[PDB]
C-alpha cells in the first residue's frame, strides 16, 4: 500500500493516508523505541533563547522554504517575482544577518502557524484571522496601547473575533519584546499562610512577580492581573487594564438556582501571550493571539482541576451528592452541571463560546477539508479529545498523526 | 536517553530508565508520532510456517531465562546455568524449546505487567495460570475454556485467570479461538444495514452461522465459540447458559431504566491476542479479570458504532436532544455508567469504577517506579472515555514502549 501513515476512524471505518507529514522539517520527541506523545513539554521545539545571531546557512534554508510556501499559496511558484523575492531575502541576510517579511507574507505566516498547531481544536476557523501588524512598536507603553486595541477589537462586546498582534521580531544580540503574563487576562493567585492559594493556583508566580514590580495586590478569588510588558533591553513595566475592557461572565446554572450564589465567573477572551511565533526562521517572541473559548477549558479544566480552582467537591456538596465514595460518580455529575453552567451563562451574556461537541464535530470537518487540501493534518490526540465525555465526541474515534510544521507557534522559556 | 516524566497535578518528576530495556520497535519515529493508532502497520505477528532464526530465538530465550531466575533470587545459581544449557541444547537440535510450568506462570504475569494499555495492572501479581499445553483437540479446548470460565466467574466474585494452549510450531497451523472474547453478543445484519445486537460482532456472528449455528434474533444473544485445532476447520461449541453470568441493568433512582431491557456479561475474557514469552508464541491464551464500568457503560453501550443507546436514554430522561449545548449526551452517559455500577453491585458481581481504577493505577506507577525504574503506559488507553481530566492519570505523563514477555495482536484466522 501507500508508503505513508495509514489513519483510521473506527466509528465510520474510513481510511486515509497522511502524506503531509512528509513535509515536516523538524523532529519531535518520539523514536521507534518509545513514544513520548503524552508529554506536555518534551525538549523538542522549545524555543530556548539563542542570543548570538543564528547560522546564516540555517536561517537561509528556513527562509527559502517559507518564501516557497508563500508563492505556492498565491500560485506563482517558479515565477520571476518568486525568484526575485528569494534573491532579495538572500541578499538581505548576506548583508544584515537577518531579513524582514512583507506585510502579506506575515499575514500568510500567521495563519499558517495557526493552521499547523497540533493542539488547537478550533482550526476550522484558521482562514479567518485579523492580523494586527505592530512591527513598528518601540516601547513598552506602545505595547500596551497595541494590546488594548487588540482586546477591544477581539472582544467586540461579546461577539468575539479571532486576532493576533505581531510585535518586532528578535534581533541580532538585542533584547526581545516580551509579554511576561501567559495570557492577557489572568486571575491572581495569592499564596496563603497555611500554604493554600486564594484565586488561581496556576498564576502564583506571575502574581508574585507583579507585586515585586510594584503592583498593589487585592485579596479576591477573581482579581484580574496587570500586564508586565518588556521592551528590548529594558526592565518590564507594569500596566493595569481598564476594567471596562476586560469582559467577564458571572456564572449561574439554568435550573440549579443556588449556583449563582457561588460567585464564580470567568473572562470572555482567551488570549495566549507567551508563545513564540516562528515564520521562515524569523522569531516573534511577542505575538499574542486570541479566539474564543471551548466550554470545557473553563468548565472542566480551569474550574475543576485539582491544581486549579478545584470546585468539584463544593458543587457536589451543593447538589448534595455522596462525596464519600467514588462509585456514586459525584465528580462526573458535578462536572457536567458546572460545564452546563458555563455554556448557559455565556449564552445569556451573549458572549461567544462553543461546546466540546460542536467544537469536535467542526474539527472533523476541518480534518476532511485538510485531507483534500494538504494530504493530512498534524494533530495531538491527547489535546484534541475533550477533558470530559471523551468518547461521546467524534475525535475520540479518529486516529491522528502528530508532527511539526512551520510556520509555527512554539513554547519559549520565561524571560525572568 | 532517559525521558523526564512529569505529573502536572502534583509537580512531581521521575525518569524512566526501564524503556532502555525495550528491544522491540514501536510505530513512532522522530519525524512523526503514531501513538494514537490502535493497530500496528507492521509490528504484527507474521506466519510461522518456518523456524524462527535460531540466533534470534536463543537470545530472547536466554533473556527470558535470565529474567526468570532473577525473579526467584537465584541468578547465577547452578540451576540457572543448567537451564540455559538445556534451552541452548534444545534449540540447537530442534529449532525451538519448551517452558517449564513455573516459567510459564512467571511469563504470563510479566506479560500482563508489561501491557501498556491495561489500567488494572496493580493486580498483576494475582493471576491463576491454567497450563493447557497438553491440548490436542478443539473439544479439549472447549473443556479447558469451560473450566476457566467457572473458575474466573466464581459466582460473581471474579478472579483473574489465563489458560495457555499449545505454542505455535514451525510449518504447522495455530491453535486459535476465533472469537475476540469468550462471551460476545451476536450482531445480526437486518433490513437496511441496521444491526440487531452488537455491531462489533457482525463478522464473527456470520461465521458461526456459516458453520452451522442456528442464530437467535435478540439484542443480547450469547454467541457460540469457534475453536480451531491445527490445520483443521474450526468447531462450534455452545456454552452452557449456567456458565455465562449476566447482569440485568437497572438504575438506582430512574424507575424506567430497567424497561430498556439492557444487560451485560460479568466476564471480560480476551481470547484473540497472542502471548509471547522468551521467543515462544502462544496463539491461544485467553485471559480474564474483571470490568471497569466505563468499558460497558460508555464504550459498549454508548459508542455510536456499538449499541448506541445515548439518544434513547436521553429521550427517556426527557432531555433536550435538539442541541449539543444542552449536554444531553454527557448527562445520559453519566446515568448509564451509574446504572452499570449499581446493577453490578446489586448482583454482587465484581466491577471497578473509573475513579477507583485510575487511582490504583497511579499507585501501581509508583510501585513500578521503585521496582523497575519505570512503567510502559499508553496514555490514550489508560485515560477513561468520560471524565478524563477528573481522574489522576489524565495529569500523568507516560512513556510507552514494548517489553517482553508480552501480549500482542495477531491476524484473524480467516
Ligand atoms: C476561534 C476559536 C478557537 C478555539 C475554540 C480554540 C480552541 C483551542 C483549545 C480548546 C485549545 C487547548 C487549550 C488548552 O487546553 O489549554 C487551543 C490551543 C491552541 N490554539 Fe486554539 N482555538 C481557537 C483559536 C485560536 C487562534 C486564533 C490561534 C492562533 C492564531 C490558536 C492557536 C492555538 C495554539 C498554538 C494552541 C496551543 C496552546 C498551548 O500549547 O498551550 N487558537 N485552542
Ligand atoms: C483485574 C481486573 C482488570 C481490569 C480492571 C482491567 C482493565 C482493563 C481495561 C479498561 C483495558 C482496556 C480495555 C478496552 O478498552 O478494550 C484493559 C486492557 C488490557 N488488559 Fe486488563 N484489566 C484487568 C485484568 C487483566 C488481566 C488478567 C490481563 C491479562 C493477564 C490483562 C491484560 C490486558 C491487556 C493485554 C489489555 C489490552 C487489550 C487490547 O489491546 O485490546 N488485564 N484492561
Ligand atoms: C500529562 C498530559 O499530557 C496532560 O495532562 C495533557 C493532556 N491533555 C491536555 N489537553 C488539553 N487541551 N490541554 C492540556 O493542558 C492537556 N494536558
Ligand atoms: C483512535 C483512538 O486511538 C481509539 O479510539 C482508542 C482511544 N483510547 C482507548 N482506550 C481504551 N481503553 N480502549 C480503546 O479501545 C481505546 N480506543
Ligand atoms: N481557547 C483557547 N485556548 N484559545 C483561543 N485562542 C487562543 N487560545
Ligand atoms: N476489563 C478488561 N477489558 N479485561 C480484563 N481482563 C481482560 N480484559
Ligand atoms: C447550594 As451551596 C450549599
Ligand atoms: C423508558 As422511556 C421509553
Ligand atoms: Zn509517539
Swiss-Prot record, chain A:
The modification Phosphoserine is found at residue 50. L-arginine binds at residues 183, 292-293, 297, 302. This is Nitric oxide synthase 3. Residues 34-416 are annotated as: Interaction with NOSIP. Belongs to the NOS family. Phosphorylation of Ser-50 by CDK5 reduces activity. (6R)-L-erythro-5,6,7,8-tetrahydrobiopterin binds at residues 38, 382-383, 396. It comes from the Eukaryota. The gene is NOS3. Produces nitric oxide (NO) which is implicated in vascular smooth muscle relaxation through a cGMP-mediated signal transduction pathway. NO mediates vascular endothelial growth factor (VEGF)-induced angiogenesis in coronary vessels and promotes blood clotting through the activation of platelets. It is found in: Cell membrane; Membrane, Caveola; Cytoplasm, Cytoskeleton; Golgi apparatus. Zn(2+) binds at residues 30, 35. The chain holds residues 67 to 482 of 1205 of the full protein. Signal peptide: none annotated. Homodimer. Interacts with NOSIP and NOSTRIN. Interacts with HSP90AB1. Forms a complex with ASL, ASS1 and SLC7A1; the complex regulates cell-autonomous L-arginine synthesis and citrulline recycling while channeling extracellular L-arginine to nitric oxide synthesis pathway. Heme b binds at residues 120, 411. It comes from Bos taurus (Bovine).
Amino acid at each position: 500500500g501507500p508508503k505513508f501513515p495509514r489513519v483510521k476512524n473506527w466509528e465510520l471505518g474510513s481510511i486515509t493516508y497522511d502524506t503531509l507529514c512528509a513535509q515536516s522539517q523538524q523532529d519531535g520527541p518520539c523514536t521507534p523505541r518509545r513514544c513520548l506523545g503524552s508529554l506536555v513539554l518534551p525538549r523538542k521545539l522549545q524555543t530556548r533563547p539563542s542570543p548570538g545571531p543564528p547560522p546564516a546557512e540555517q536561517l537561509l534554508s528556513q527562509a527559502r522554504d517559507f518564501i516557497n510556501q508563500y508563492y505556492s499559496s498565491i500560485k506563482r511558484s517558479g515565477s520571476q517575482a518568486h525568484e526575485e523575492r528569494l534573491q532579495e531575502v538572500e541578499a538581505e541576510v548576506a548583508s544584515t544577518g537577518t531579513y524582514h517579511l512583507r506585510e502579506s507574507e506575515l499575514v500568510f505566516g500567521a495563519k499558517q502557524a495557526w493552521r499547523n498547531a497540533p493542539r488547537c481544536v478550533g482550526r476550522i476557523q484558521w482562514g479567518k484571522l485579523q492580523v494586527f501588524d505592530a512591527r513598528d512598536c518601540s516601547s513598552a507603553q506602545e505595547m500596551f496601547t497595541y494590546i488594548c486595541n487588540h482586546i477591544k477589537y477581539a472582544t467586540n462586546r461579546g461577539n468575539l473575533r479571532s486576532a493576533i498582534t505581531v510585535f518586532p521580531q528578535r534581533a541580532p544580540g538585542r533584547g526581545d519584546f516580551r509579554i511576561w503574563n501567559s495570557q492577557l487576562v489572568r486571575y491572581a493567585g495569592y499564596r496563603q499562610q497555611d500554604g493554600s492559594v486564594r484565586g488561581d493556583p496556576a498564576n502564583v508566580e506571575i502574581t508574585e512577580l507583579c507585586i515585586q514590580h510594584g503592583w498593589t495586590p487585592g485579596n479576591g478569588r477573581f482579581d484580574v492581573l496587570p500586564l508586565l510588558l518588556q521592551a528590548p533591553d529594558e526592565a518590564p513595566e507594569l500596566f493595569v487594564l481598564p476594567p471596562e475592557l476586560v469582559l467577564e461572565v458571572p456564572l449561574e446554572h439554568p435550573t440549579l438556582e443556588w449556583f449563582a450564589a457561588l460567585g464564580l465567573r470567568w473572562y470572555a477572551l482567551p488570549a495566549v501571550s507567551n508563545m513564540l511565533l516562528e515564520i521562515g526562521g524569523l522569531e516573534f517572541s511577542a505575538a499574542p493571539f486570541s479566539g474564543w473559548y471551548m466550554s470545557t477549558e473553563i468548565g472542566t479544566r480551569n474550574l475543576c482541576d485539582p491544581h486549579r480552582y478545584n470546585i468539584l467537591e463544593d458543587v457536589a456538596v451543593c447538589m448534595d451528592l455522596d462525596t464519600r465514595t467514588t462509585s456514586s460518580l459525584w465528580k462526573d455529575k458535578a462536572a457536567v452541571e458546572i460545564n452546563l453552567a458555563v455554556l448557559h451563562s455565556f449564552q445569556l451574556a451573549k458572549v461567544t463560546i462553543v461546546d466540546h461537541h460542536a467544537a469536535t464535530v467542526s474539527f472533523m470537518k476541518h480534518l476532511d477539508n485538510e485531507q483534500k487540501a494538504r494530504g493530512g493534518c498534524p494533530a495531538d490526540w491527547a489535546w484534541i479529545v475533550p477533558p470530559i465525555s471523551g468518547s461521546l465526541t467524534p475525535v475520540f474515534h479518529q486516529e491522528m498523526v502528530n508532527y511539526i510544521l512551520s510556520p509555527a507557534f512554539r513554547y519559549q522559556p520565561d524571560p525572568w
